């Protein structure tokens, strides 16, 4: 945890980051609802099987 002073020289538009996702299989259509995404700049590797 860090506390720093600065000045904001830009601010991107507000976009939608998923906190939960529901992934459905193409073959059997079964779902894997409510997969907890990590917070911040980070991605998720979908299950392969």
């Amino acid at each position: 945890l860090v506390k720093i002073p600065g000045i904001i020289i830009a601010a991107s538009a507000v976009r939608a980051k998923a906190t939960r996702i529901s992934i459905q299989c193409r073959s059997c259509r079964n779902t894997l609802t409510n997969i907890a995404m990590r917070p911040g700049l980070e991605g998720y590797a979908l299950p392969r099987k």
């Binding site: 992934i23 894997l32 997969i35 979908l46 299950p47 099987k49």
Partner: protein, 198 residues
């Protein structure tokens, strides 16, 4: 594979048979039918047991839980945790082998003479020179059976055997003596057979 001797069977029991392992010099030191005396250490050997009842799993001590889509459940989870059944057999590891009752203290007469000690050799020589050795052997071999001196003599000659031979054309001349005893019940036939065996 050896099995327990009859002298140690408990009542109404079947002999226990276990496999013993011979390594290096002793590899071929035991042959079927021998009353050997294996000296070594008992050991356990992992077994692929067919027991349908789960028992004594062994798994990792690291606490790991599968993520969504890769949960530690089923064969996947068993494999991931490295679960293996701890089923074992008891096996004997014999470093040395030897007969339970040594006979002496290729094969030839000179080989036997060298193998047997001085006292045993002199005993064999003196009994060979001894007179009426035929009757002496018969009596000393059947000290409880009365009469049947002809049967005793025939069984002794059977024990000593003949001289097997092979003809030039290949046909073999059997040298072993075959003896049969026919008679009325309670005539000591089984007694002769049991004497011969023991």
């Amino acid at each position: 594979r050896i099995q327990e001797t009859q002298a140690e069977l408990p009542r109404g029991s079947i002999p226990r048979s276990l496999e013993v392992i011979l390594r290096a010099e002793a590899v071929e030191s035991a042959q079927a039918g021998d009353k050997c005396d294996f000296t070594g250490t008992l050991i356990v050997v992992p077994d692929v047991s067919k027991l349908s009842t789960p028992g004594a799993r062994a798994e990792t001590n690291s606490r790991v839980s599968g993520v969504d889509g890769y949960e530690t459940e089923g064969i996947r989870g068993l494999r991931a945790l490295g679960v293996r059944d701890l089923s074992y057999r008891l096996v004997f590891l014999a470093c040395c082998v030897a007969p339970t009752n040594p006979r002496f203290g290729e094969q030839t007469a000179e080989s036997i003479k060298n193998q047997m000690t001085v006292k045993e050799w002199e005993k064999v020589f003196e009994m060979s020179q001894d007179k009426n050795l035929y009757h002496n052997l018969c009596t000393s071999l059947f000290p409880t059976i009365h009469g049947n001196d002809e049967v005793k003599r025939g069984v002794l000659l059977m024990l000593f055997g003949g001289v097997p031979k092979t003809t030039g054309e290949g046909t073999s001349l059997r040298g072993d003596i075959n003896v049969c005893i026919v008679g009325d019940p309670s005539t000591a036939k089984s007694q002769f057979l049991k004497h011969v065996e023991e």
